[PDB]
Design a protein around this ligand. Structure first.
Ligand SMILES: O=C(O)c1ccccc1Nc1cccc(C(F)(F)F)c1
Ligand SMILES: O=C(O)c1ccccc1Nc1cccc(C(F)(F)F)c1
Lengths: 114, 114, 114, 114
């Protein structure tokens, strides 16, 4: 899997478990087409969203449903969700780890590309 | 002004000057309508995007053109841009400061609501 | 004032008010000598820690009492406190803003130097 | 190993490899006694610093030599190093992952405790 998402909880000091993640790919008409989706595991990870065959060059949007996550904790979050938009494989296939660190009013995101 | 954006550069240790910021508001048909735009000042700040009369409850998207910013520095960035999506004034008018700290492969964003 | 500290709360989406901040300077014998201290205001800011006459080149440590801050909110924090260690004015006097964004198990810190 | 350190590079979008890490434990006389040290691997990770037998309750300081790391990249960093100070095993043995995300003028740190 060339696309992995990892999500952490900065309030509890633990992985953000069962966070919904939706991935979209920009279509020719500049629309976001659904690409893959999943929920993070107990380790706050989501693997197996794609295959390198299917993961072609393009602009992808990784949307993390942070709102639902905090609501389930009884916390009222600021953001509707966290989005990470990036061009991928523009120079051939690469492995992308998109990480997010969550707090009710803040998130940090980083990408490790190899 | 009930909405202010501040953008900092984590690589140079300075405000991110002249970063284009586009603000949209979700329309009834679930589309993003253009709302306000501008460029950050020499202090990395963007004020006067709205008025509290015009700033009604709704879901707003603040889009920060980070890609152009790094390209201008000769650095190749990961993200197409940074987006902050949030519901505003759902409980009456508030002052929102949306801050972003930028790095080529990472960004952190926080909201200070008062 | 050539040294300012700003502290924000990522859980409440507000400035971190009344956070104790202690600044030290490395002495010849490699010990931390007390330099300045204070508490953040209602805006999460702490100014007037020094004067540019007194603020000479050296290694300074800004210590932020985050533990007390979270305890006062009834939250159990991970860190004893946050420390920022940096060499200052090594190239003549500059204005330093040290900012920190706090969460129970995490903190981000940036410097804006001008 | 109950203590793991992971360090990432926000400028290159990769793990921060070969970063020196020194861990200290607060002694009875309130002095920092050397506890363990190592360098991060190609994956930006440092494991095997201790054993759960040796990792007793106490206040520990994890110091990350960020300055040397950036200097080797020809970048001049703001911080001397990044320090993470925390009380550990105060409620019995736990596994601690201390993560840091680095930029020349900024770092973020989080702890995942299990
Ligand atoms: O901790 C992981 O295992 C991790 C994995 C991939 C990328 C980043 C990772 N950690 C981390 C540590 C601090 C801050 C952030 C960020 F906010 F950028 F997502 C991520
Ligand atoms: O530094 C400011 O003046 C600031 C203003 C409003 C909100 C946050 C601010 N500072 C700050 C300091 C560290 C990290 C971040 C964040 F990444 F969240 F944007 C923001």
């Amino acid at each position: 899997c060339p696309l992995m998402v990892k999500v952490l909880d900065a309030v509890r000091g633990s992985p953000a478990i069962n966070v919904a993640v939706h991935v979209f790919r920009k279509a020719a008409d500049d629309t976001w087409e659904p690409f893959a989706s999943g929920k993070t595991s107990e380790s706050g990870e989501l693997h197996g969203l794609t295959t390198e065959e299917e993961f072609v060059e393009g602009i992808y949007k990784v949307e993390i449903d942070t709102k639902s996550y905090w609501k389930a904790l009884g916390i009222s979050p600021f953001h509707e969700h966290a989005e990470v938009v990036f061009t991928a494989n523009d120079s051939g296939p690469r492995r992308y780890t998109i990480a997010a660190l969550l707090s009710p009013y803040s998130y940090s995101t980083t990408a490790v590309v190899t």
